[PDB]
């Protein structure tokens, strides 16, 4: 009854109806692994469990990467329908494009030739790396990470050098008018008003390194 | 009788029993669960028999989200009309302590016996997770004062789970198609809880979890899914032909690992990378996006006919499709969609358009 | 005369229009080399290039004012905008000057084109200069050359070759300074 | 390659789903068809023996066997999965004593003990509940000697007591191809021969997926067909040049002339012994 | 089932060695046929400024030449100049004319007759066994003028560097055959040059095309043969990195099965202990 | 866990002093997921190698 | 392993001690010729890594 | 010889062991390090070649017979 | 397998640096001083941070 260990309590873990409240409590068990083995008795008894997963690499992490998400297997169905919407048409775009930079560091590693096409979406799945990277007990508002997740697969951030994208997206919250964010917490939606302006906003934008 | 269920990989390879006991095998998110509500969403809706839902020991967020996407498609009816449903749900889920998990299937089973015997028509019965069966009553039986079996299970496994396992049959009076998902822990296949589900299924479906992180969806293990259909006297000649002739290729491609992950792809035969290739092929051309997962995929979902999986992997096997990509395979419906895919992205390196088509600079007002 | 203009520049056209588009259009010799023959200039004045060849060896790439080859019509000796000649040259020494001193290795036979730039190209097979022969088996060699008169063509041009060469190695052994 | 006399026994072992019953099938179904041959000094009855199986499986089997006509000969003993599991451990000892009367009265036997390994799972069932200690994979201690008292009741008896045969053809199921697991080891080590069938030849398209070279029968060839035997050292001997001058035929570039006869050869040769189900040749 | 996990992880171990070895044995050939390529170089360079690059002939009579390996753990070299040789056997075939197919190794005879089977014709190998020689290469040229073509095509896989394998292919035409005919610009681009030969023109340029020929081959296999060991220093590399990474995880599985192994007996012992106490 | 937590959470700092405490490792069967070492890995806050 | 090479009796040749192979017992010419019989064969299994 | 370890034979041994067994085990830590690398012995290194030639050597020097202690 | 003069200047540069990098990190100590003569140093943290 191990099983039953987690999940008599794991399933307390609820969004209630509105006859009953509709409160919620929101979960977030943590399990530690041994060697990347998620095919563990104790792991897989809590991913059976829970709704989504949130895997982290220990070769990402030493790597630099951090949060060392594996975006792969890192899933969560039932937050889909709970993502911001301004976030929902912009990392979209983010994950398909990391998709195929996992392809492509995944084959090219041994230096056999450059398509020049994978070889375009390699350094842009490197961009959109290390626009992921964040430090720690900095947590950023919604709105905040879905300028920069604009700002990073819109192309805006394009030719800033891998090693300038820690400061560049710094660059980039810190100078885009600050009721751009407003207008994009409140309707919580790139609105057509709001990307044309957006767009405006991030031309003027002193990158690091030009 | 053959069930046509619109997944190529259960189509092709191990076909399902009109009538007969099916289980979908894997463990901890390889996608057992999306495999039976795609099998409700293309069966359950084209049956015209009734249906009952026995949920042992899952979600119950699950079992919330089923009540509620049956109430939308009319399958559930509530209130005056509710005699015009189509399904029973018995809910016994994992919140329950293990003398409720260890008694809910009886307690579905009994519910699909009685329109199998008194009403005497075709159910259908979907249990998730006819392995917490066997848990809740491992868990009971230490403390039923016994000396252990082998992993920690307990000595009646064989026999708890033959009882139960025996009822669910089609009979001369009515029959009942039976598709129960199997846990297995650790994703070991040996574990006795699975070991001992084999022998009461016709139709196996095991999903495995490295063919779930290939991308490859639905994760089913072509090489390890077997079918009491898949017999030339039963669908055909030339679907068992197509068939075997996919599994000949599957296992060619097995047999040839080794040598790719520590030599390279480059020191094999000439027959042997073209076996590489088409093996490549139809291990996408096995993946099809599922209407339950449209919601959090994005594709829509391609319910594939049966003719169609098999004029199209005879189309691959032959050599018809040498000359496509592989990734014009991956999450596609069937034979014409291949190609379809294959111009949709071979326009895209293609696709470099002038001037950026701005018209945004000072919209006016 | 002129109906057919092969080359590198219009392979690619036949080649693009023929071949599959996952191999670029192979590469060719006369990419890897800079220096033509009928272009302009690679005189200037006294000096002139003069590129000594063997298969295994490269044995001068830099400028000289004079070379002395020994054709098969007898040595002759190549000034800066010297006529374009391509010369088959008979085992002799070949001398290359640059002013007080100068390099000489005795060849074994092999052609050595002059070009309408002035670039000089000796293209010898075995380049033995005078320092490394031995004045010794010479002579147990070409005993044997002037011996041997067999029944058969071939091994008579052998012998005929073996003495034109071996009599040559023996007037460039005595008289060097 | 693994001939079957009147008498000895041969273990069908194998992983799930890669051929056991279908050979076991094809051995009764022909039995039936060389009956009408032959006159009644040389009939072979058999006894089918279904340990833990489903009723529709054992209904399906029935029904084949009256299609085929071998119901005639054919007894079928049947403890099904959901049967007590004394029932399940008593039922091979019940089937072999009904094959036990044409062995003692000088007619020939063909049992077939499907399922071996799940009459030891029922015997573990009934012995842990009896509180007797377990051992290894928690199976008693004498889980060898309830397969070795019943699998040595299959013999070839003397002229004085009748000259009656009974062959016993028991089924072990493997995990993985496992071959090194207790109830395996011991049926491995009771048994006269072993017919060891493999997942990865019969998805090959190798179907009966006989493994050539782990299959043995130790009464040799002394119980071959004359003929057969004649050909059988030749197809053996070939097909042993075939096994191991490959793990090089994935390099089909560099033709030998000398190995590569041997390989498309013994490709031939095993491409011959492939064969469809329900019809015994 | 425990033990043959630590079977083929000294399997995998040894390949890892092995591999690594020869890795380093392909890096010292590599570095000493570097020497002999590019001082083999420069005596091809007077051919091509004196008879010019004409890959795009017409030819009627052609003798393609596709230089392989002999050692065929190489990585794709060899099959990627049988794809030229097939584009370039599809360039000038379009008029109705003879081709002969030769290769030099023993990677080409097994790759080439899959391609084509009539036109190939003669096949040269163990020619890297010892070492390759001017007087080889030139025994092969007068092997190749056993027939008599008007043009020559040699395949072979240029050492770049470490890292590129430029296919290049190298053309030659018989001497008045094809290459009197080629030359003819409104007269003659060779009438500038003063024959200084002991016979006619048309003979020292039927010695100079066979020259042309022994140096282009020797140099074509030279390059491929240090660009086989290039590439072979390579290949070995990312075959010992797989080879770490299969024995990594075969290492990890394998202490997964011994700590599940070990509680299984410990289980079974404890079980078997308390049925009695 | 119990046992050497116990042993372990004993060392720490408090307001007065504190006690550092330098462990030798010995990993069983060169298993660095063996239950001993896996365990005591939880509480150990550097590690210094020292190599041949 | 010697007996599907086809080899009867498939005795290994490198697993198979007797204390009658000392050389004072049966003599130094017969216990160096089964040494060097267990030499080359072993060196032989060192270069099945290779030549298979 | 790799995997046998004797931690007290720092400085208790035989002097004249001691001088010459440094040298003897450092010589057979490279020739185990580049052994089964080169077991063929046609394309090596000059100094490759010369640490397994030595180790070769003192392999066959360290065996000895049974009943005879030196 | 290839050469001290194989790679580039820069690799020369972290070759050097790291060469006395692994010395630095190098220490006498000052219980050793009784057996290796050399007194020992007891270095602060504001220095190898700088000195680093
Ligand atoms: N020679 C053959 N030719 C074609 N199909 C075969 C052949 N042998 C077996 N099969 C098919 O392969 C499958 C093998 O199932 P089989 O009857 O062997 O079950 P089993 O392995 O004995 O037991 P279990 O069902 O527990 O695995 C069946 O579907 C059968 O129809
Ligand atoms: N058919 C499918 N197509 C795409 N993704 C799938 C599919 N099935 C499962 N997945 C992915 O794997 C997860 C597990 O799906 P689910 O069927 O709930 O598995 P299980 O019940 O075995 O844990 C899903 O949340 C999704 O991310
Ligand atoms: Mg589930
Ligand atoms: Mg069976």
């Given at each position: 009854?191990?099983?039953?260990?987690?999940?008599?309590?794991?399933?307390?873990?609820?969004?209630?109806?509105?006859?009953?409240?509709?409160?919620?409590?929101?979960?977030?068990?943590?399990?530690?692994?041994?060697?990347?083995?998620?095919?563990?008795?104790?792991?897989?008894?809590?991913?059976?469990?829970?709704?989504?997963?949130?895997?982290?690499?220990?070769?990402?992490?030493?790597?630099?990467?951090?949060?060392?998400?594996?975006?792969?297997?890192?899933?969560?169905?039932?937050?889909?329908?709970?993502?911001?919407?301004?976030?929902?048409?912009?990392?979209?775009?983010?994950?398909?494009?990391?998709?195929?930079?996992?392809?492509?560091?995944?084959?090219?590693?041994?230096?056999?030739?450059?398509?020049?096409?994978?070889?375009?979406?390699?350094?842009?799945?490197?961009?959109?790396?290390?626009?992921?990277?964040?430090?720690?007990?900095?947590?950023?508002?919604?709105?905040?990470?879905?300028?920069?997740?604009?700002?990073?697969?819109?192309?805006?951030?394009?030719?800033?050098?891998?090693?300038?994208?820690?400061?560049?997206?710094?660059?980039?919250?810190?100078?885009?008018?600050?009721?751009?964010?407003?207008?994009?917490?409140?309707?919580?939606?790139?609105?057509?008003?709001?990307?044309?302006?957006?767009?405006?906003?991030?031309?003027?934008?002193?990158?690091?390194?030009? | 009788?053959?069930?046509?269920?619109?997944?190529?990989?259960?189509?092709?390879?191990?076909?399902?029993?009109?009538?007969?006991?099916?289980?979908?095998?894997?463990?901890?998110?390889?996608?057992?669960?999306?495999?039976?509500?795609?099998?409700?969403?293309?069966?359950?809706?084209?049956?015209?028999?009734?249906?009952?839902?026995?949920?042992?020991?899952?979600?119950?967020?699950?079992?919330?989200?089923?009540?509620?996407?049956?109430?939308?498609?009319?399958?559930?009816?509530?209130?005056?009309?509710?005699?015009?449903?189509?399904?029973?749900?018995?809910?016994?889920?994992?919140?329950?302590?293990?003398?409720?998990?260890?008694?809910?299937?009886?307690?579905?089973?009994?519910?699909?016996?009685?329109?199998?015997?008194?009403?005497?028509?075709?159910?259908?019965?979907?249990?998730?997770?006819?392995?917490?069966?066997?848990?809740?009553?491992?868990?009971?039986?230490?403390?039923?004062?016994?000396?252990?079996?082998?992993?920690?299970?307990?000595?009646?496994?064989?026999?708890?789970?033959?009882?139960?396992?025996?009822?669910?049959?089609?009979?001369?009076?009515?029959?009942?198609?039976?598709?129960?998902?199997?846990?297995?822990?650790?994703?070991?296949?040996?574990?006795?809880?699975?070991?001992?589900?084999?022998?009461?299924?016709?139709?196996?479906?095991?999903?495995?979890?490295?063919?779930?992180?290939?991308?490859?969806?639905?994760?089913?293990?072509?090489?390890?899914?077997?079918?009491?259909?898949?017999?030339?006297?039963?669908?055909?000649?030339?679907?068992?032909?197509?068939?075997?002739?996919?599994?000949?290729?599957?296992?060619?491609?097995?047999?040839?690992?080794?040598?790719?992950?520590?030599?390279?792809?480059?020191?094999?035969?000439?027959?042997?990378?073209?076996?590489?290739?088409?093996?490549?092929?139809?291990?996408?051309?096995?993946?099809?996006?599922?209407?339950?997962?449209?919601?959090?995929?994005?594709?829509?979902?391609?319910?594939?006919?049966?003719?169609?999986?098999?004029?199209?992997?005879?189309?691959?096997?032959?050599?018809?499709?040498?000359?496509?990509?592989?990734?014009?395979?991956?999450?596609?419906?069937?034979?014409?969609?291949?190609?379809?895919?294959?111009?949709?992205?071979?326009?895209?390196?293609?696709?470099?358009?002038?001037?950026?088509?701005?018209?945004?600079?000072?919209?006016?007002? | 005369?002129?109906?057919?203009?092969?080359?590198?520049?219009?392979?690619?056209?036949?080649?693009?229009?023929?071949?599959?588009?996952?191999?670029?259009?192979?590469?060719?010799?006369?990419?890897?080399?800079?220096?033509?023959?009928?272009?302009?200039?690679?005189?200037?004045?006294?000096?002139?290039?003069?590129?000594?060849?063997?298969?295994?060896?490269?044995?001068?790439?830099?400028?000289?004012?004079?070379?002395?080859?020994?054709?098969?019509?007898?040595?002759?000796?190549?000034?800066?905008?010297?006529?374009?000649?391509?010369?088959?040259?008979?085992?002799?020494?070949?001398?290359?000057?640059?002013?007080?001193?100068?390099?000489?290795?005795?060849?074994?036979?092999?052609?050595?084109?002059?070009?309408?730039?002035?670039?000089?190209?000796?293209?010898?097979?075995?380049?033995?200069?005078?320092?490394?022969?031995?004045?010794?088996?010479?002579?147990?060699?070409?005993?044997?050359?002037?011996?041997?008169?067999?029944?058969?063509?071939?091994?008579?041009?052998?012998?005929?070759?073996?003495?034109?060469?071996?009599?040559?190695?023996?007037?460039?052994?005595?008289?060097?300074? | 390659?693994?001939?079957?006399?009147?008498?000895?026994?041969?273990?069908?072992?194998?992983?799930?789903?890669?051929?056991?019953?279908?050979?076991?099938?094809?051995?009764?179904?022909?039995?039936?068809?060389?009956?009408?041959?032959?006159?009644?000094?040389?009939?072979?009855?058999?006894?089918?023996?279904?340990?833990?199986?489903?009723?529709?499986?054992?209904?399906?089997?029935?029904?084949?066997?009256?299609?085929?006509?071998?119901?005639?000969?054919?007894?079928?003993?049947?403890?099904?999965?959901?049967?007590?599991?004394?029932?399940?451990?008593?039922?091979?000892?019940?089937?072999?004593?009904?094959?036990?009367?044409?062995?003692?009265?000088?007619?020939?036997?063909?049992?077939?003990?499907?399922?071996?390994?799940?009459?030891?799972?029922?015997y573990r069932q009934m012995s842990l509940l009896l509180r007797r200690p377990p051992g290894r994979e928690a199976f008693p201690g004498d889980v060898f000697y309830l397969?070795?008292?019943?699998?040595?009741?299959?013999?070839?008896?003397?002229?004085?007591?009748?000259?009656?045969?009974?062959?016993?053809?028991?089924?072990?199921?493997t995990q993985a191809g496992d071959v090194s697991a207790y109830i395996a080891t011991n049926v491995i080590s009771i048994t006269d021969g072993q017919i060891f069938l493999?997942?990865?030849?019969?998805?090959?398209?190798?179907?009966?997926?006989?493994?050539?070279?782990?299959?043995?029968?130790?009464?040799?060839?002394?119980?071959?067909?004359?003929?057969?035997?004649?050909?059988?050292?030749?197809?053996?001997?070939?097909?042993?040049?075939?096994?191991?001058?490959?793990?090089?035929?994935?390099?089909?570039?560099?033709?030998?002339?000398?190995?590569?006869?041997?390989?498309?050869?013994?490709?031939?040769?095993?491409?011959?012994?492939?064969?469809?189900?329900?019809?015994?040749? | 089932?425990?033990?043959?996990?630590?079977?083929?992880?000294?399997?995998?171990?040894?390949?890892?060695?092995?591999?690594?070895?020869?890795?380093?044995?392909?890096?010292?050939?590599?570095?000493?046929?570097?020497?002999?390529?590019?001082?083999?170089?420069?005596?091809?360079?007077?051919?091509?400024?004196?008879?010019?690059?004409?890959?795009?002939?017409?030819?009627?009579?052609?003798?393609?030449?596709?230089?392989?390996?002999?050692?065929?753990?190489?990585?794709?070299?060899?099959?990627?100049?049988?794809?030229?040789?097939?584009?370039?056997?599809?360039?000038?075939?379009?008029?109705?004319?003879?081709?002969?197919?030769?290769?030099?190794?023993?990677?080409?005879?097994?790759?080439?007759?899959?391609?084509?089977?009539?036109?190939?014709?003669?096949?040269?190998?163990?020619?890297?066994?010892?070492?390759?020689?001017?007087?080889?290469?030139?025994?092969?040229?007068?092997?190749?003028?056993?027939?008599?073509?008007?043009?020559?095509?040699?395949?072979?896989?240029?050492?770049?560097?470490?890292?590129?394998?430029?296919?290049?292919?190298?053309?030659?035409?018989?001497?008045?055959?094809?290459?009197?005919?080629?030359?003819?610009?409104?007269?003659?681009?060779?009438?500038?040059?003063?024959?200084?030969?002991?016979?006619?023109?048309?003979?020292?340029?039927?010695?100079?095309?066979?020259?042309?020929?022994?140096?282009?081959?020797?140099?074509?296999?030279?390059?491929?043969?240090?660009?086989?060991?290039?590439?072979?220093?390579?290949?070995?590399?990312?075959?010992?990195?797989?080879?770490?990474?299969?024995?990594?995880?075969?290492?990890?599985?394998?202490?997964?099965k011994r700590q599940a192994t070990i509680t299984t007996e410990l289980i079974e012992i404890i079980a078997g202990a308390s049925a009695l106490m």
């Amino acid at each position: 009854d191990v099983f039953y260990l987690h999940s008599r309590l794991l399933e307390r873990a609820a969004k209630l109806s509105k006859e009953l409240g509709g409160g919620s409590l929101t979960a977030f068990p943590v399990i530690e692994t041994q060697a990347g083995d998620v095919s563990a008795y104790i792991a897989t008894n809590v991913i059976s469990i829970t709704d989504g997963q949130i895997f982290l690499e220990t070769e990402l992490f030493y790597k630099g990467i951090r949060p060392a998400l594996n975006v792969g297997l890192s899933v969560s169905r039932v937050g889909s329908a709970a993502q911001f919407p301004g976030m929902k048409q912009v990392a979209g775009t983010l994950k398909l494009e990391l998709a195929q930079y996992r392809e492509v560091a995944a084959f090219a590693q041994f230096g056999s030739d450059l398509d020049a096409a994978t070889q375009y979406v390699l350094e842009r799945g490197a961009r959109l790396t290390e626009m992921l990277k964040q430090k720690q007990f900095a947590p950023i508002p919604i709105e905040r990470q879905t300028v920069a997740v604009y700002a990073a697969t819109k192309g805006f951030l394009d030719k800033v050098r891998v090693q300038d994208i820690v400061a560049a997206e710094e660059a980039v919250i810190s100078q885009v008018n600050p009721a751009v964010f407003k207008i994009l917490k409140a309707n919580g939606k790139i609105t057509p008003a709001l990307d044309a302006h957006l767009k405006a906003e991030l031309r003027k934008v002193k990158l690091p390194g030009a | 009788e053959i069930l046509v269920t619109g997944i190529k990989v259960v189509d092709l390879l191990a076909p399902y029993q009109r009538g007969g006991k099916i289980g979908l095998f894997g463990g901890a998110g390889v996608g057992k669960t999306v495999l039976i509500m795609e099998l409700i969403n293309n069966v359950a809706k084209a049956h015209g028999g009734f249906s009952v839902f026995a949920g042992v020991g899952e979600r119950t967020r699950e079992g919330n989200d089923l009540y509620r996407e049956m109430i939308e498609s009319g399958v559930i009816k509530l209130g005056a009309e509710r005699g015009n449903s189509k399904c029973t749900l018995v809910y016994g889920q994992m919140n329950e302590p293990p003398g409720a998990r260890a008694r809910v299937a009886l307690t579905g089973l009994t519910v699909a016996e009685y329109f199998r015997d008194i009403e005497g028509q075709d159910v259908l019965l979907f249990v998730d997770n006819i392995f917490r069966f066997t848990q809740a009553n491992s868990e009971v039986s230490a403390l039923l004062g016994r000396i252990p079996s082998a992993v920690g299970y307990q000595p009646t496994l064989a026999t708890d789970l033959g009882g139960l396992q025996e009822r669910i049959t089609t009979t001369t009076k009515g029959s009942i198609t039976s598709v129960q998902a199997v846990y297995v822990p650790a994703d070991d296949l040996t574990d006795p809880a699975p070991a001992t589900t084999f022998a009461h299924l016709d139709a196996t479906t095991v999903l495995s979890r490295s063919i779930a992180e290939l991308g490859i969806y639905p994760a089913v293990d072509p090489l390890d899914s077997t079918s009491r259909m898949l017999n030339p006297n039963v669908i055909g000649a030339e679907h068992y032909n197509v068939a075997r002739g996919v599994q000949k290729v599957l296992q060619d491609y097995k047999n040839l690992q080794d040598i790719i992950a520590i030599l390279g792809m480059d020191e094999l035969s000439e027959e042997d990378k073209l076996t590489v290739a088409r093996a490549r092929k139809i291990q996408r051309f096995l993946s099809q996006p599922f209407q339950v997962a449209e919601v959090f995929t994005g594709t829509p979902g391609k319910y594939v006919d049966l003719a169609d999986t098999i004029s199209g992997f005879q189309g691959v096997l032959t050599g018809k499709y040498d000359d496509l990509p592989e990734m014009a395979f991956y999450m596609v419906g069937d034979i014409k969609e291949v190609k379809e895919k294959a111009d949709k992205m071979a326009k895209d390196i293609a696709s470099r358009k002038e001037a950026d088509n701005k018209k945004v600079s000072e919209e006016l007002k | 005369e002129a109906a057919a203009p092969a080359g590198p520049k219009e392979f690619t056209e036949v080649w693009n229009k023929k071949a599959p588009s996952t191999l670029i259009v192979p590469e060719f010799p006369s990419n890897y080399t800079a220096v033509k023959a009928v272009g302009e200039g690679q005189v200037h004045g006294d000096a002139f290039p003069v590129n000594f060849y063997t298969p295994h060896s490269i044995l001068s790439q830099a400028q000289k004012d004079t070379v002395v080859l020994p054709g098969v019509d007898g040595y002759f000796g190549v000034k800066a905008s010297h006529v374009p000649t391509i010369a088959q040259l008979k085992p002799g020494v070949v001398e290359l000057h640059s002013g007080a001193e100068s390099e000489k290795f005795f060849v074994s036979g092999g052609f050595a084109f002059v070009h309408p730039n002035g670039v000089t190209d000796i293209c010898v097979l075995e380049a033995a200069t005078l320092d490394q022969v031995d004045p010794a088996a010479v002579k147990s060699a070409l005993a044997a050359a002037s011996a041997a008169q067999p029944t058969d063509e071939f091994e008579q041009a052998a012998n005929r070759a073996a003495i034109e060469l071996y009599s040559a190695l023996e007037s460039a052994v005595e008289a060097k300074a | 390659l693994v001939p079957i006399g009147r008498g000895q026994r041969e273990l069908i072992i194998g992983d799930r789903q890669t051929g056991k019953t279908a050979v076991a099938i094809d051995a009764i179904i022909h039995q039936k068809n060389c009956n009408e041959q032959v006159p009644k000094a040389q009939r072979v009855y058999c006894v089918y023996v279904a340990v833990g199986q489903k009723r529709s499986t054992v209904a399906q089997l029935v029904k084949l066997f009256t299609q085929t006509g071998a119901m005639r000969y054919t007894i079928m003993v049947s403890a099904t999965a959901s049967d007590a599991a004394p029932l399940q451990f008593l039922a091979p000892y019940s089937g072999c004593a009904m094959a036990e009367y044409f062995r003692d009265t000088g007619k020939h036997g063909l049992i077939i003990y499907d399922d071996l390994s799940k009459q030891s799972v029922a015997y573990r069932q009934m012995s842990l509940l009896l509180r007797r200690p377990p051992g290894r994979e928690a199976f008693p201690g004498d889980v060898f000697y309830l397969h070795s008292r019943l699998l040595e009741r299959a013999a070839k008896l003397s002229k004085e007591l009748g000259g009656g045969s009974l062959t016993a053809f028991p089924v072990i199921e493997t995990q993985a191809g496992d071959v090194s697991a207790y109830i395996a080891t011991n049926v491995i080590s009771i048994t006269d021969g072993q017919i060891f069938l493999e997942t990865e030849l019969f998805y090959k398209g190798i179907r009966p997926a006989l493994n050539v070279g782990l299959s043995v029968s130790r009464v040799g060839s002394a119980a071959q067909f004359p003929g057969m035997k004649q050909v059988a050292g030749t197809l053996k001997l070939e097909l042993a040049q075939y096994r191991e001058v490959a793990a090089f035929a994935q390099f089909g570039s560099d033709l030998d002339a000398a190995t590569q006869y041997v390989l498309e050869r013994g490709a031939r040769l095993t491409e011959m012994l492939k064969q469809k189900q329900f019809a015994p040749i | 089932s425990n033990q043959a996990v630590k079977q083929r992880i000294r399997a995998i171990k040894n390949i890892g060695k092995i591999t690594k070895a020869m890795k380093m044995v392909a890096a010292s050939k590599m570095k000493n046929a570097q020497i002999a390529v590019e001082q083999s170089r420069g005596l091809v360079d007077p051919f091509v400024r004196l008879f010019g690059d004409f890959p795009a002939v017409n030819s009627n009579k052609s003798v393609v030449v596709a230089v392989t390996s002999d050692k065929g753990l190489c990585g794709g070299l060899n099959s990627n100049i049988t794809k030229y040789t097939r584009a370039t056997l599809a360039t000038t075939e379009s008029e109705g004319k003879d081709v002969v197919v030769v290769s030099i190794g023993d990677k080409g005879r097994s790759q080439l007759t899959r391609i084509e089977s009539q036109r190939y014709q003669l096949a040269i190998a163990d020619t890297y066994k010892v070492r390759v020689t001017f007087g080889q290469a030139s025994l092969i040229v007068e092997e190749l003028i056993k027939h008599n073509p008007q043009s020559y095509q040699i395949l072979f896989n240029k050492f770049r560097s470490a890292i590129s394998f430029k296919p290049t292919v190298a053309t030659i035409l018989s001497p008045d055959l094809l290459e009197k005919q080629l030359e003819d610009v409104t007269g003659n681009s060779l009438d500038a040059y003063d024959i200084e030969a002991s016979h006619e023109r048309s003979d020292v340029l039927r010695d100079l095309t066979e020259f042309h020929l022994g140096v282009t081959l020797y140099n074509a296999m030279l390059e491929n043969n240090c660009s086989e060991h290039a590439s072979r220093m390579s290949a070995m590399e990312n075959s010992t990195k797989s080879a770490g990474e299969m024995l990594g995880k075969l290492t990890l599985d394998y202490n997964r099965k011994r700590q599940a192994t070990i509680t299984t007996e410990l289980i079974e012992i404890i079980a078997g202990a308390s049925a009695l106490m």
